[PDB]
Curated annotation (Swiss-Prot), chains A, B, C, D, E:
One of its GO terms (biological process) is dopamine uptake involved in synaptic transmission. It comes from Homo sapiens. The lineage of its organism: Eukaryota, Metazoa, Chordata, Craniata, Vertebrata. It comes from the Eukaryota. The chain holds residues 15 to 96 of 140 of the full protein. The gene is SNCA. This is Alpha-synuclein. Neuronal protein that plays several roles in synaptic activity such as regulation of synaptic vesicle trafficking and subsequent neurotransmitter release. Participates as a monomer in synaptic vesicle exocytosis by enhancing vesicle priming, fusion and dilation of exocytotic fusion pores. Mechanistically, acts by increasing local Ca(2+) release from microdomains which is essential for the enhancement of ATP-induced exocytosis. Keywords: Acetylation, Alzheimer disease, Amyloid, Cell projection, Copper, Cytoplasm, Disease variant, Membrane, Metal-binding, Neurodegeneration, Nucleus, Parkinson disease, Parkinsonism, Phosphoprotein, Repeat, Secreted, Synapse, Ubl conjugation. It is linked to Genetic alterations of SNCA resulting in aberrant polymerization into fibrils, are associated with several neurodegenerative diseases (synucleinopathies). SNCA fibrillar aggregates represent the major non A-beta component of Alzheimer disease amyloid plaque, and a major component of Lewy body inclusions. They are also found within Lewy body (LB)-like intraneuronal inclusions, glial inclusions and axonal spheroids in neurodegeneration with brain iron accumulation type 1. Parkinson disease 1, autosomal dominant: A complex neurodegenerative disorder characterized by bradykinesia, resting tremor, muscular rigidity and postural instability. Additional features are characteristic postural abnormalities, dysautonomia, dystonic cramps, and dementia. The pathology of Parkinson disease involves the loss of dopaminergic neurons in the substantia nigra and the presence of Lewy bodies (intraneuronal accumulations of aggregated proteins), in surviving neurons in various areas of the brain. Cu cation binds at residue 27. It is found in: Cytoplasm; Membrane; Nucleus; Synapse. Changing residue 34 to K: Increases oligomerization. The 'non A-beta component of Alzheimer disease amyloid plaque' domain (NAC domain) is involved in fibrils formation. The middle hydrophobic region forms the core of the filaments. The C-terminus may regulate aggregation and determine the diameter of the filaments.
Amino acid sequence: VVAAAEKTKTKEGVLYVGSKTKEGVVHGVATVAEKTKEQVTNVGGAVVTGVTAVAQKTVEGAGSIAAATGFVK
Amino acid sequence: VVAAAEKTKTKEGVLYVGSKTKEGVVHGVATVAEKTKEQVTNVGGAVVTGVTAVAQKTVEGAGSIAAATGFVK
Amino acid sequence: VVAAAEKTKTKEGVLYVGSKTKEGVVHGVATVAEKTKEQVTNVGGAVVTGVTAVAQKTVEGAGSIAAATGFVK
Amino acid sequence: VVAAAEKTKTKEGVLYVGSKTKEGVVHGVATVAEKTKEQVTNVGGAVVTGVTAVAQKTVEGAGSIAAATGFVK
Amino acid sequence: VVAAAEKTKTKEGVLYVGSKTKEGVVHGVATVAEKTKEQVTNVGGAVVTGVTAVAQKTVEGAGSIAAATGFVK
């Protein structure tokens, strides 16, 4: 499991957000197990969670994610 | 499982968001197991979750995701 | 499990956010186990959680995530 | 499990946030186990949690996360 | 488990935040075990938690996190 990232090197990249929520419940990244034997979970990269979620320009630079998730029996 | 990303190198990339929610419930990334033996889960890359979700310009730079998810028995 | 990142080297990258929430519950990253034998969980990279979540320019520089999650029996 | 990061080397990178919340509960990163035998959990990288969460320019420099999470039996 | 980081070398990097919360409960990073036999948990990197959380420019310099979390039986 190898990840390699290389980077070699007027409004730009500007965000305005206004949010008005009376009630918010946000769970993000959740793993829940009840009465479970084996649970393997991988979350990788960018997760944005919100009642109001904005992601801008998340990977201008190179980004690498490598995942190997699981079990050997 | 190998990921490689390489990058070699007027309004641009500008977002305006207004959001008004009375009630919000957001779950993001969730794995739930009840009474399960084997659960393997991989989430990779960008997940944006929201009552109002905006993703802009998520990978201008090179992005790589490699996943190998599972089990050998 | 190897990750390598290399970086070699008017409004830019500017965010305005206004948020008004009466009630907020946010869970971020959560792993919950009730009555579970084996739970393996990896969270990698950037997670932004919020009633109002903004991510801007998260990886201009190179970013690498490598994960190997699981069990051998 | 090896991570290597190398870096070699008008408003830029400016954020304004205003937040008004009457009530906030935020959980950040949480692992909860009730009645569980084996729970292995790794959280890596940047997690921002909030009723109002902003992440700007999180990895301009190179960033590497490597994780090996799990058990051998 | 080895991490190596190397760094070799108008408003820039400026944040304004105003927050007004009547009530706040924030949990940061928490591991809770009730009645559990084995719980292994690693949190790495930067976690920002708040009713109002801002992270700006978290890793301009190179940053590496390496984690090996788990048990051998």
